[PDB]
């Protein structure tokens, strides 16, 4: 049980809570479930941890308190 802290584009504060034991993509799931947004497009940092799908959130060493921040970097074409 660690709560995340998640901050959109809009840098508001989302608070919802998750397993430290729970796996990248399945919350990054969540997230671009929340806002419609491909993982292609969307990609989230944390204490300057990047995102891989497939580690733990303990695989990160950190714990509940920790910022999840959207980055958009797109161009279309």
Partial sequence: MMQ?????????????????????????????????????????????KQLEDGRTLADYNIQKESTLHLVLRLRGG
């Avoid at 998750?18 to 990609?43: F, L, M």
Wanted: proline share 4%; no cysteine; hydrophobic share 35%.
């Fill in 4 to 48: 995340i802290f998640v901050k959109t584009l809009t840098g508001k504060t989302i608070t919802l809570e998750v397993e430290s034991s729970d796996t990248i993509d399945n919350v990054k799931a969540k997230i671009q479930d929340k806002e419609g947004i491909p993982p292609d497009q969307q990609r989230l940092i944390f204490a300057g």
